[PDB]
Tab-separated table of C-alpha atoms and ligand atoms in Angstrom:
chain	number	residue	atom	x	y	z
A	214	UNK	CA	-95.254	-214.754	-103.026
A	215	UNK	CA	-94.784	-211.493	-101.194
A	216	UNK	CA	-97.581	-210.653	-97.949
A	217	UNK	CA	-95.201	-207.919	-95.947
A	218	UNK	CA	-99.001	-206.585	-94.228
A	219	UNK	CA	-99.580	-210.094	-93.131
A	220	UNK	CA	-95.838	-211.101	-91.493
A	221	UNK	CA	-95.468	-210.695	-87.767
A	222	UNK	CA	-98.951	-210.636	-87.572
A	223	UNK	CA	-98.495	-213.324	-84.386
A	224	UNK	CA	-98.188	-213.120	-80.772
A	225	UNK	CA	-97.642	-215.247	-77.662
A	226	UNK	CA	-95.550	-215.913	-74.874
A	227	UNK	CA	-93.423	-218.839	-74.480
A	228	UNK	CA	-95.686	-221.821	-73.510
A	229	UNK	CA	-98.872	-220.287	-74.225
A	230	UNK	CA	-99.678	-220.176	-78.137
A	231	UNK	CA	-99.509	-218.084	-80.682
A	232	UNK	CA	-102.528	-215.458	-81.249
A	233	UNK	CA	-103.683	-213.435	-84.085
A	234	UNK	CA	-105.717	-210.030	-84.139
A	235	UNK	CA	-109.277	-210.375	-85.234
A	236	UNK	CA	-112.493	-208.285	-85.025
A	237	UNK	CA	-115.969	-209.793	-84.865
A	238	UNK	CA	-119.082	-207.915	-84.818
A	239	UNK	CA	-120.547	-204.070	-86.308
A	240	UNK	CA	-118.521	-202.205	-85.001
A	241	UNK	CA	-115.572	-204.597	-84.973
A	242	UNK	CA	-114.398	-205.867	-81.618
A	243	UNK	CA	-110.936	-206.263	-81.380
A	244	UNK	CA	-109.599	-210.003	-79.638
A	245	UNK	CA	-106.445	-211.987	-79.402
A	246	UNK	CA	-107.316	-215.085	-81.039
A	247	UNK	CA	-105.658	-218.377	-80.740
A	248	UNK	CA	-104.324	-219.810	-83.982
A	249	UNK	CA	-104.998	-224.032	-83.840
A	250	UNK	CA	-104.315	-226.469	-86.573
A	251	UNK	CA	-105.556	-228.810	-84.141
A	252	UNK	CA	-109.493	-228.221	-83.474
A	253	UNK	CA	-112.452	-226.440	-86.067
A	254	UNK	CA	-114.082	-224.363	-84.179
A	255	UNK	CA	-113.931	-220.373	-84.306
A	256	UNK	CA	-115.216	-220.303	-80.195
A	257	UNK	CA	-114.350	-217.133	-78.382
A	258	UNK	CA	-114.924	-215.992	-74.716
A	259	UNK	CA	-118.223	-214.174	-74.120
A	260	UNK	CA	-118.396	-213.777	-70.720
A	261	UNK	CA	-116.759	-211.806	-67.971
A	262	UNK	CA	-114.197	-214.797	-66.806
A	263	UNK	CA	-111.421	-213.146	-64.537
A	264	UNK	CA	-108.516	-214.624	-66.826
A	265	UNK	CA	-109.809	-212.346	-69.813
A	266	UNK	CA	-108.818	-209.231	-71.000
A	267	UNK	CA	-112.118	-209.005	-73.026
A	268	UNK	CA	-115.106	-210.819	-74.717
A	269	UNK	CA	-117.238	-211.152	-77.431
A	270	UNK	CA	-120.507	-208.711	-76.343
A	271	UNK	CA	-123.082	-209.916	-78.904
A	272	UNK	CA	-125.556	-207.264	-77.236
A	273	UNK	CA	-123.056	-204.467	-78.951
A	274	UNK	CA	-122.937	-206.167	-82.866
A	275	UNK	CA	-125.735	-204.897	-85.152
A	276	UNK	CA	-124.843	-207.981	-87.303
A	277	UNK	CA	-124.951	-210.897	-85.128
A	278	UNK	CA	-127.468	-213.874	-85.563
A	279	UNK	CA	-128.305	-216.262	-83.051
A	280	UNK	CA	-128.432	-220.050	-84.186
A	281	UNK	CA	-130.468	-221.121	-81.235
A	282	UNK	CA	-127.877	-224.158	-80.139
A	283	UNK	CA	-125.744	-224.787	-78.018
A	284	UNK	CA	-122.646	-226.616	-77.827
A	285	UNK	CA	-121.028	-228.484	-74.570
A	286	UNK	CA	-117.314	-229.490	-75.484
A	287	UNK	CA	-115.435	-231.838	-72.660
A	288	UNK	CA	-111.945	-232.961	-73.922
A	289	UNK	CA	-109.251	-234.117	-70.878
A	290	UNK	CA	-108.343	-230.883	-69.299
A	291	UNK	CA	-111.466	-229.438	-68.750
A	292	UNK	CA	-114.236	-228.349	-70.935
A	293	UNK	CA	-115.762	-225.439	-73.025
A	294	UNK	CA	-119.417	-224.935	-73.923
A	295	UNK	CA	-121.125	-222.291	-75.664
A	296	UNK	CA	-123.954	-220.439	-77.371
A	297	UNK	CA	-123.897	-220.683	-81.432
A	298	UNK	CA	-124.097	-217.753	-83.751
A	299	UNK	CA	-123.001	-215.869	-87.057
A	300	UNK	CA	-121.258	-212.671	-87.528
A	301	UNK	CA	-118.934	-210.554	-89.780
A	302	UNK	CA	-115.398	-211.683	-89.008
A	303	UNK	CA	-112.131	-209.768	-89.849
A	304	UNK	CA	-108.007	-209.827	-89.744
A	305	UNK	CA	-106.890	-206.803	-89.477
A	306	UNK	CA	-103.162	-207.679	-90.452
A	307	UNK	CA	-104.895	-210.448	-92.904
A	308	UNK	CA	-106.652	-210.023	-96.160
A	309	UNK	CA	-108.751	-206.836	-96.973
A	310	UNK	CA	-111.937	-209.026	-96.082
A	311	UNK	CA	-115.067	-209.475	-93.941
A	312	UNK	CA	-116.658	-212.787	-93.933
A	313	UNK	CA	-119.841	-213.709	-91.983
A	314	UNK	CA	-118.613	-216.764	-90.127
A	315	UNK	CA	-119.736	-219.012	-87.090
A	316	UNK	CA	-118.720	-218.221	-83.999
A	317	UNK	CA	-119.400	-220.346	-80.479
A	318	UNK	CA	-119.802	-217.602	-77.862
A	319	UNK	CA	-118.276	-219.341	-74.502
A	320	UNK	CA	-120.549	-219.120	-71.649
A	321	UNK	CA	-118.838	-221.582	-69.101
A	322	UNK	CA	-115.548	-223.321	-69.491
A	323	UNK	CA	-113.003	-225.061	-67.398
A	324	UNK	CA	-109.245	-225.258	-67.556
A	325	UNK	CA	-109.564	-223.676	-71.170
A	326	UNK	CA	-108.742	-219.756	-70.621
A	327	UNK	CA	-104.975	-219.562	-69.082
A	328	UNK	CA	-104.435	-217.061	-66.053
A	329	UNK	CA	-101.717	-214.614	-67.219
A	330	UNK	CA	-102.513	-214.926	-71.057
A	331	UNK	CA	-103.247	-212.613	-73.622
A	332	UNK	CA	-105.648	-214.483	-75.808
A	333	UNK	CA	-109.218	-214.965	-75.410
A	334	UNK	CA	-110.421	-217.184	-78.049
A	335	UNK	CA	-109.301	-220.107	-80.318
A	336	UNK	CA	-109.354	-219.982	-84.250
A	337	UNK	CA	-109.971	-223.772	-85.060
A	338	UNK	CA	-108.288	-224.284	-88.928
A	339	UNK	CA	-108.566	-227.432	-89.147
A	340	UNK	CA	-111.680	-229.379	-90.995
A	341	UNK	CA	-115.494	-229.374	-90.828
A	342	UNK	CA	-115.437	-233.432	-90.166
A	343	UNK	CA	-114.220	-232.180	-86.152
A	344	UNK	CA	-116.050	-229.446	-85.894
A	345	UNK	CA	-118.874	-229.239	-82.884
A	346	UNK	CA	-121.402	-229.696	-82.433
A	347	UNK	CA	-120.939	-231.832	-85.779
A	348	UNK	CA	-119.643	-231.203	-88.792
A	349	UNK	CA	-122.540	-228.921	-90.421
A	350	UNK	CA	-121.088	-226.375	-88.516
A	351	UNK	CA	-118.716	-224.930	-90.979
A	352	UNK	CA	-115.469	-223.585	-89.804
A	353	UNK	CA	-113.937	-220.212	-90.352
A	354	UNK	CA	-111.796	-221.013	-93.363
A	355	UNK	CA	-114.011	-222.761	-95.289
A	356	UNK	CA	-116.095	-219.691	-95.220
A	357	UNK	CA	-113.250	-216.984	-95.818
A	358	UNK	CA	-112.547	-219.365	-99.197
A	359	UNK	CA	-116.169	-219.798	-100.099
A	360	UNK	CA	-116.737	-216.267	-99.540
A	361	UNK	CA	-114.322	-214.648	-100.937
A	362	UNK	CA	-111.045	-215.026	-103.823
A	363	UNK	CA	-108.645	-215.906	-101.286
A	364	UNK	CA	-106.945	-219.144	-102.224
A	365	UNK	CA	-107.990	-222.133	-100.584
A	366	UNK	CA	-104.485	-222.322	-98.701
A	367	UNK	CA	-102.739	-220.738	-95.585
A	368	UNK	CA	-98.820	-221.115	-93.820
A	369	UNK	CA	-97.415	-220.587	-90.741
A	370	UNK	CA	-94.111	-219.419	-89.627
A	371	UNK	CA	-93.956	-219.753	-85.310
A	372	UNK	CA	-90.778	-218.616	-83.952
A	373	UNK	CA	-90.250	-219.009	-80.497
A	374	UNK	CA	-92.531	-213.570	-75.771
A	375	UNK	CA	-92.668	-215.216	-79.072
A	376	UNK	CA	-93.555	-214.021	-82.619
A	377	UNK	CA	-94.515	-215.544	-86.004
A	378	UNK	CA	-96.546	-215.060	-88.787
A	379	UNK	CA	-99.946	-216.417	-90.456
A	380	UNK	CA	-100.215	-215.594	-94.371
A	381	UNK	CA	-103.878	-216.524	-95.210
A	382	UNK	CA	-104.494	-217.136	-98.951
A	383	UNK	CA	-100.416	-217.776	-99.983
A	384	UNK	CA	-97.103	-218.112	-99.357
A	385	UNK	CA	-94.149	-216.091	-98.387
A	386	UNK	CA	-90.685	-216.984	-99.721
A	387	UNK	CA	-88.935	-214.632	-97.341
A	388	UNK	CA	-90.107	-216.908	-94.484
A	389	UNK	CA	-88.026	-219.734	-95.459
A	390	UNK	CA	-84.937	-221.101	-97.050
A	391	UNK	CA	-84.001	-223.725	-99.018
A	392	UNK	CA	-87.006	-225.868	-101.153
A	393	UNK	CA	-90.310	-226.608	-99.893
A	394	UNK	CA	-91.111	-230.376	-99.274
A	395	UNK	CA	-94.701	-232.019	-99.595
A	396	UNK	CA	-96.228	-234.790	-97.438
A	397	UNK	CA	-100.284	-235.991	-98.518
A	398	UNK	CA	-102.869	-234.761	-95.823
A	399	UNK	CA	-103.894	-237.998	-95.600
A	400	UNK	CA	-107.597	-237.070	-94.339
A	401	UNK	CA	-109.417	-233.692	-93.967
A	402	UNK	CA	-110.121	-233.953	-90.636
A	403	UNK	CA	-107.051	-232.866	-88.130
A	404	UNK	CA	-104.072	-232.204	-90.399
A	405	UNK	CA	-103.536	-235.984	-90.823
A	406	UNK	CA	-100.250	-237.143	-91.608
A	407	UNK	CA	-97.727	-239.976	-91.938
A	408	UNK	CA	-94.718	-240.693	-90.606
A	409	UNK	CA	-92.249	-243.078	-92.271
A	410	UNK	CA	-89.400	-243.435	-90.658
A	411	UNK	CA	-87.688	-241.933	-87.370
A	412	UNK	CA	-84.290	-241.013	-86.613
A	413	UNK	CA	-81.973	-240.044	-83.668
A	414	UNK	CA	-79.088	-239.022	-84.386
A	415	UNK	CA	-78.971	-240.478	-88.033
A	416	UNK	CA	-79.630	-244.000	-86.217
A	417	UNK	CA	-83.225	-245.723	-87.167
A	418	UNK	CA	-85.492	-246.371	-84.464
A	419	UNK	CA	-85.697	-249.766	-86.575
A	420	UNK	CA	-89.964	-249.806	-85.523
A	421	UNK	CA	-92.972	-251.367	-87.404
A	422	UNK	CA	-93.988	-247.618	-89.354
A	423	UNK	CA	-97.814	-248.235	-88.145
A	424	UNK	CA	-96.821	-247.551	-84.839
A	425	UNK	CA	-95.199	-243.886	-85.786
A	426	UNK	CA	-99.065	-243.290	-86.966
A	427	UNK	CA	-100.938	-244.916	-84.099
A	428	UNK	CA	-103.639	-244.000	-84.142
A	429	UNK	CA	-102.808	-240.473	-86.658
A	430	UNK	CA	-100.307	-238.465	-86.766
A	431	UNK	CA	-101.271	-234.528	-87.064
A	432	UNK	CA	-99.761	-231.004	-87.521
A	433	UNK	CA	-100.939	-229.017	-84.278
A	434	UNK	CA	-100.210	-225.473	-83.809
A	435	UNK	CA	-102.259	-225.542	-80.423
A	436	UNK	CA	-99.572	-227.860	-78.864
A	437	UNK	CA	-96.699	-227.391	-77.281
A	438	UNK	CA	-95.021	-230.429	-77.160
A	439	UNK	CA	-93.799	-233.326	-79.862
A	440	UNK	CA	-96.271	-235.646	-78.212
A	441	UNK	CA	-94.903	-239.414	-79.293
A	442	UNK	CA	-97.126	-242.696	-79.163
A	443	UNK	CA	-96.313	-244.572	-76.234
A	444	UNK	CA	-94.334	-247.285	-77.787
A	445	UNK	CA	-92.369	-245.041	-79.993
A	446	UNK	CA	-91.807	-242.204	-77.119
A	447	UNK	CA	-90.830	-245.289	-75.003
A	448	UNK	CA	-87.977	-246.133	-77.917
A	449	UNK	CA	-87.116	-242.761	-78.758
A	450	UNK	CA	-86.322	-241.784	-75.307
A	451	UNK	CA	-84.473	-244.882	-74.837
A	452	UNK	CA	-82.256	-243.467	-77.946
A	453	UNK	CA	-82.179	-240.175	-76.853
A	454	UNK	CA	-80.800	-241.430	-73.659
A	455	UNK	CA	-77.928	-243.621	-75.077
A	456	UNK	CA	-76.792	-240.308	-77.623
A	457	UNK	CA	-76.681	-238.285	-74.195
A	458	UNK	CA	-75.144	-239.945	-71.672
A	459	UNK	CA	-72.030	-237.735	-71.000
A	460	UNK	CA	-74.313	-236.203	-68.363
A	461	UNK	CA	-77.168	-238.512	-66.491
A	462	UNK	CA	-80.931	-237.070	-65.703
A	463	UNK	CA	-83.399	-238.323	-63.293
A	464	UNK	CA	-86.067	-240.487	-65.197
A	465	UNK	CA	-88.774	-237.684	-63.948
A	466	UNK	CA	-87.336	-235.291	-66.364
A	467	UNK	CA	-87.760	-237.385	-69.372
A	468	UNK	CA	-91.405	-237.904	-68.060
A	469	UNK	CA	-91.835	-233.910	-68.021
A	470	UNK	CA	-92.650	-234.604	-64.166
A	471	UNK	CA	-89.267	-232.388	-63.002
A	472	UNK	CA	-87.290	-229.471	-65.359
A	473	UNK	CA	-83.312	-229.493	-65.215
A	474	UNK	CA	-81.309	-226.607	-65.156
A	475	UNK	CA	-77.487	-225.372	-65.870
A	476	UNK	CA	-74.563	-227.689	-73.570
A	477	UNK	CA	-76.768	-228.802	-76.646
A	478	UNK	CA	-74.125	-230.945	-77.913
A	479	UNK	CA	-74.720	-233.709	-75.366
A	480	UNK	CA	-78.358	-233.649	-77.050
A	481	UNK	CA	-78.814	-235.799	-80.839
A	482	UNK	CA	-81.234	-234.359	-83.202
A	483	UNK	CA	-84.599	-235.708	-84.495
A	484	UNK	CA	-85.572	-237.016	-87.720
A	485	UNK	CA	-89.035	-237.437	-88.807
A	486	UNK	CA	-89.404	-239.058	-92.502
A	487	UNK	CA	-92.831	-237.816	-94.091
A	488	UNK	CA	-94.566	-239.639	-97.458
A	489	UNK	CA	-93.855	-237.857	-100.114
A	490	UNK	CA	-95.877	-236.529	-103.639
A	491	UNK	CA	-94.542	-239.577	-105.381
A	492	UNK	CA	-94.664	-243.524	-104.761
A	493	UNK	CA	-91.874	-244.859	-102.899
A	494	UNK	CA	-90.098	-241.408	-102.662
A	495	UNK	CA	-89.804	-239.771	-99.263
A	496	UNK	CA	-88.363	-236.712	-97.020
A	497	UNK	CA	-87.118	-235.950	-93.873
A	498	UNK	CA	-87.413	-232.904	-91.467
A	499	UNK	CA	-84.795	-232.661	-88.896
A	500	UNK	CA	-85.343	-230.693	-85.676
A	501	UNK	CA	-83.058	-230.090	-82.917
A	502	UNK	CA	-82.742	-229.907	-78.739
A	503	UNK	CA	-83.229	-225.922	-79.036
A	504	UNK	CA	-87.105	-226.930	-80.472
A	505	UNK	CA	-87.270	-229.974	-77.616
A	506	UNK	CA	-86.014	-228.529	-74.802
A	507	UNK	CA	-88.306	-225.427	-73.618
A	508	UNK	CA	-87.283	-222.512	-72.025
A	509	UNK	CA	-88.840	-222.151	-68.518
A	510	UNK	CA	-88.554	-218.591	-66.918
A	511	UNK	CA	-81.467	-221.496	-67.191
A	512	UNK	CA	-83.906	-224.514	-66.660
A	513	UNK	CA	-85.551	-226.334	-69.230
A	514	UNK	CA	-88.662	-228.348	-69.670
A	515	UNK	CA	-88.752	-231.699	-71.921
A	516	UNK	CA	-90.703	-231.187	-74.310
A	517	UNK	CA	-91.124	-234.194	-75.648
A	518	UNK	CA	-94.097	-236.529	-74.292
A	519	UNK	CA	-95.806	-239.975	-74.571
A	520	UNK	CA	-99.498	-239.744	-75.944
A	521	UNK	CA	-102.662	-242.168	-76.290
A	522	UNK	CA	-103.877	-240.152	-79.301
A	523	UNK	CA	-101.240	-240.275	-81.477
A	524	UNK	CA	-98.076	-238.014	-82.965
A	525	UNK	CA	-98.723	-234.812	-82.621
A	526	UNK	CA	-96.125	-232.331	-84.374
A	527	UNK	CA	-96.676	-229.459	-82.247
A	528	UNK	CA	-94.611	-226.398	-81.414
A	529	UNK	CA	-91.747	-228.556	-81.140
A	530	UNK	CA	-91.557	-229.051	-84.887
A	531	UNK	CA	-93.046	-226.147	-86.450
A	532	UNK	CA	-91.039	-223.730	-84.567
A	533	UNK	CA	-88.487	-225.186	-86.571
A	534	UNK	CA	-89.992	-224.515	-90.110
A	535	UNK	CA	-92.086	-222.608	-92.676
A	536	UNK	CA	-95.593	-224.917	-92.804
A	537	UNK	CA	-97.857	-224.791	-95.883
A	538	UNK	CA	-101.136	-226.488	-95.315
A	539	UNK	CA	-101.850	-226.360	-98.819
A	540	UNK	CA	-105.445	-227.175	-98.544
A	541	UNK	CA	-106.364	-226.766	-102.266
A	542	UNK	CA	-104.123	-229.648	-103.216
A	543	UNK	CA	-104.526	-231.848	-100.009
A	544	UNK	CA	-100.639	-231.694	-98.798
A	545	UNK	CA	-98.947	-229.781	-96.455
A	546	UNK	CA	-95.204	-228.265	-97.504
A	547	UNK	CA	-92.531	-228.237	-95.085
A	548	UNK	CA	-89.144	-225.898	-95.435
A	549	UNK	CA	-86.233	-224.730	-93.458
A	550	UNK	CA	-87.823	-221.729	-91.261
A	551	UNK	CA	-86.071	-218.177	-91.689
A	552	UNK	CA	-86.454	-218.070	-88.043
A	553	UNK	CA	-85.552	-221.275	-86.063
A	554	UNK	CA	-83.423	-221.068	-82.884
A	555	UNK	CA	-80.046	-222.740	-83.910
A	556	UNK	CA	-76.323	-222.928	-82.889
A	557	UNK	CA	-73.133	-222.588	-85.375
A	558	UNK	CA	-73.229	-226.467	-85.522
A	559	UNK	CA	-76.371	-227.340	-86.162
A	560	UNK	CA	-79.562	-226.312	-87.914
A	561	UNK	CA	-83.049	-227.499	-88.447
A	562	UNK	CA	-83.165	-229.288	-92.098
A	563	UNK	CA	-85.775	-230.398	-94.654
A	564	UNK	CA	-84.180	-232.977	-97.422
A	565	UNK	CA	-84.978	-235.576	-99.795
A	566	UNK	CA	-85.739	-236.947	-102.002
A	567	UNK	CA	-85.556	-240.341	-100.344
A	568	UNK	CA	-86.341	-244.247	-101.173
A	569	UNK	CA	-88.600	-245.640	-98.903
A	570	UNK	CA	-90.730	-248.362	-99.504
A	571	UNK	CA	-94.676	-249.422	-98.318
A	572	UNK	CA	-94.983	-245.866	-97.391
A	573	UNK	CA	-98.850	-247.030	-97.281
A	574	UNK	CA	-98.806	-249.670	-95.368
A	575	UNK	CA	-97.382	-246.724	-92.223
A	576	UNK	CA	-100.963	-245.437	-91.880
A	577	UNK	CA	-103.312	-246.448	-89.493
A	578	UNK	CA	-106.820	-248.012	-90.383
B	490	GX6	C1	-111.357	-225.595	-79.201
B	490	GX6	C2	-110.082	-226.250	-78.896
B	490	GX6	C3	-108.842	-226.752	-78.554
B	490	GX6	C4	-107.523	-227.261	-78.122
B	490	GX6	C5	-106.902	-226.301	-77.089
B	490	GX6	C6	-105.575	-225.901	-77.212
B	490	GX6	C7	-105.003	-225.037	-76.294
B	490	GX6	N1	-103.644	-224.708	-76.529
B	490	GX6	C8	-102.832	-223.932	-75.774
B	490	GX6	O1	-103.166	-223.346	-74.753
B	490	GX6	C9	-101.433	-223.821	-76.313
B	490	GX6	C10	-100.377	-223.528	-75.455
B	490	GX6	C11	-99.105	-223.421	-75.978
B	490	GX6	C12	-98.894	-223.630	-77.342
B	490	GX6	C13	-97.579	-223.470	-77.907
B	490	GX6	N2	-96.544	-223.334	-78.379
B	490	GX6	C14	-100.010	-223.899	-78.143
B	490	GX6	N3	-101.248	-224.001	-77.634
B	490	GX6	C15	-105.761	-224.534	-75.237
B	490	GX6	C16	-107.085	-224.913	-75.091
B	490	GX6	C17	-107.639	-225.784	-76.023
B	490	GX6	F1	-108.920	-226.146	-75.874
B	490	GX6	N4	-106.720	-227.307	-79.372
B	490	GX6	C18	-105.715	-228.290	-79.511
B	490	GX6	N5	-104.981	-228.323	-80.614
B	490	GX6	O2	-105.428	-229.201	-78.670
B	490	GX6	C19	-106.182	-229.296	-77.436
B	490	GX6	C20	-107.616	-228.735	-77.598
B	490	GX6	C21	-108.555	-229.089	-76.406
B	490	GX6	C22	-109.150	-230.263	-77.228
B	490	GX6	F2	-110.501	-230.273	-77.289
B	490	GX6	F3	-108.677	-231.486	-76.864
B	490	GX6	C23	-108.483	-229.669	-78.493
C-alpha cells in the first residue's frame, strides 16, 4: 500500500512518453526506457543512431546470451528490427530485483527513436499473445512475476517536462483519491477493454455500444492522444462542437491538421462508461479539456483523433487517473489521480455504480 522508493520514478517531456530507469547487462547499463501498455516487447537501441543518448553494448555484458533470431517489426510510422537475446534486467527505483529477461537489441529502425528525446528504448507491458516475433517470446513482466515474489500486478500514475510514477508489484493509495473502480480486461493481449456508454457533457452520444469497441478498445500508455473510432470520433466531435460554440474553430483543428492559440469553460467534459465487476452494473470516468487539449511549446493541440484500430485511452485519459492493471485478477482499476491538471470548477471523476444493460453485447467479435 505504501512504495515511497518507487514514486516519481517517471520521466518525459510533454508529447514524448513517459520513461523509466533501467539497467541491463553485468555491469548494469543505465537507459531511459519507455513505459508502453500498448506493445510486449522489452526492445532497446543498440546501435550508435544520432537521436540516442546511449545503447545497449552487448560486447560489454558478461551475462548476455544470444538467441540467434532476429526480429523485423513494420507498424505505420516506420519500423524497428532487431537482434534477440537474454540478459539480467533491473529498476533501479523498482523492486530490489534482477531478472534475466528478453531483450530485442535494435539494429535498424525508422521513425521509431524521436530527435530531441531522452529515451532510448521501449518497455512493452502488455501480453505475450503480441509479442514479436510471436508470442513464445515472453515479455518482461511475465518474467519479473515468474521469477521472482513480486505480485503479478503493476499501476501507473502519468501526470503531465512531465513526471509520474510506475509501482511494480502493488499499489499506492497516496496516488489517488476517492475509490478505485474495476473494468474486466477483456483479453490478455493489448489491455483490452469495453466501453459502454459515452458522454459529452452529461448528454449520450445515443450510438450502437459495438461501435465504442470497434474493433477493441485498449489502455495505452505509449499514446498520446484519445484516439476515437471513426464513426464515434465523427459523433463526438460533432457534440463537442455544439457544447462549444461560443467561439468557432476551423475544421483543421478538430482534425489535429492546425493548433489554436489564445477559456476551458467553452470546452464540455468526457465521459467514458466502462463494464463493471458485476452483471448489468457499470462506471464512468470523466476527463476534462485540460487532458484533451495539449500544451504545445499559449497554443494547443487537439488531442483527440479518429482511428482505424480502435479506442485507444492514451495519455489523454490516464493523465487524468491512478491505473491498476491488476493482472492477477484480469481487470484494470481506475481512480481519481492525486495529480491531474484541473481548474476550481471542474475535476477529473471516477463514479458508479451504474445500471447499464447488455454490457456484453458492446464488445467486438
Ligand atoms: C515496440 C513498440 C511500440 C509503439 C510505439 C510507441 C511510441 N510512443 C511514443 O513515442 C509516445 C509519445 C508520447 C506519449 C505520451 N504521452 C506516449 N508515447 C513510439 C514508438 C513506438 F514504436 N507502442 C504503442 N503503444 O503504440 C505504437 C507502437 C508502434 C506500434 F508497433 F504500432 C506500437
Amino acid at each position: 500500500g505504501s512504495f515511497v522508493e518507487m514514486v516519481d520514478n517517471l520521466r518525459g517531456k510533454s508529447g514524448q512518453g513517459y520513461y523509466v530507469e533501467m539497467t541491463v547487462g553485468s555491469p548494469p547499463q543505465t537507459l531511459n526506457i519507455l513505459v508502453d501498455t500498448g506493445s510486449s516487447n522489452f526492445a532497446v537501441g543498440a546501435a550508435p543512431h544520432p537521436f540516442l543518448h546511449r545503447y545497449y553494448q552487448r560486447q560489454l555484458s558478461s551475462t548476455y546470451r544470444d538467441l540467434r533470431k532476429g526480429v523485423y517489426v513494420p507498424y505505420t510510422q516506420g519500423k524497428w528490427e532487431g537482434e534477440l537475446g537474454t540478459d539480467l534486467v533491473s529498476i533501479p527505483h523498482g523492486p530490489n530485483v534482477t531478472v534475466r529477461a528478453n531483450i530485442a537489441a535494435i539494429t535498424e529502425s525508422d521513425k521509431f527513436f524521436i530527435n530531441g528525446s531522452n529515451w532510448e528504448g521501449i518497455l512493452g507491458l502488455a501480453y505475450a499473445e503480441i509479442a514479436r516475433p510471436d508470442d513464445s517470446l515472453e515479455p518482461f513482466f511475465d518474467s519479473l512475476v515468474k521469477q521472482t515474489h513480486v505480485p503479478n500486478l503493476f499501476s501507473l500514475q502519468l501526470c503531465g517536462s512531465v513526471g509520474g510514477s510506475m509501482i511494480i508489484g502493488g499499489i499506492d493509495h497516496s496516488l489517488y483519491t476517492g475509490s478505485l473502480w474495476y473494468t474486466p480486461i477483456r483479453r490478455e493481449w493489448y489491455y483490452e477493454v469495453i466501453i459502454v456508454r459515452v458522454e459529452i457533457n452529461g448528454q449520450d452520444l445515443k450510438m450502437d455500444c459495438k461501435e465504442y469497441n470497434y474493433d477493441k478498445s485498449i489502455v495505452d500508455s505509449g499514446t498520446t492522444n484519445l484516439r476515437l473510432p471513426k464513426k464515434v470520433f465523427e459523433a463526438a466531435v460533432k457534440s463537442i462542437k455544439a457544447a462549444s460554440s461560443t467561439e468557432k474553430f476551423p475544421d483543421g483543428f478538430w482534425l489535429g491538421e492546425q493548433l489554436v492559440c489564445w477559456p476551458w469553460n467553452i470546452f464540455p467534459v468526457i465521459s467514458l462508461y466502462l463494464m463493471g465487476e458485476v452483471t448489468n452494473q457499470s462506471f464512468r470516468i470523466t476527463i476534462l479539456p485540460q487532458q484533451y487539449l495539449r500544451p504545445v511549446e499559449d497554443c494547443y493541440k487537439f488531442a483527440i483523433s479518429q482511428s482505424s484500430t480502435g479506442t485507444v485511452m492514451g495519455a489523454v485519459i490516464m493523465e487524468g487517473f491512478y491505473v491498476v492493471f491488476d493482472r492477477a485478477r484480469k481487470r484494470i482499476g481506475f481512480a481519481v489521480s492525486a495529480c491531474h491538471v484541473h481548474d476550481e470548477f471542474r475535476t477529473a471523476a471516477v463514479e458508479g455504480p451504474f445500471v447499464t444493460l447488455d454490457m456484453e453485447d458492446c464488445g467486438y467479435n
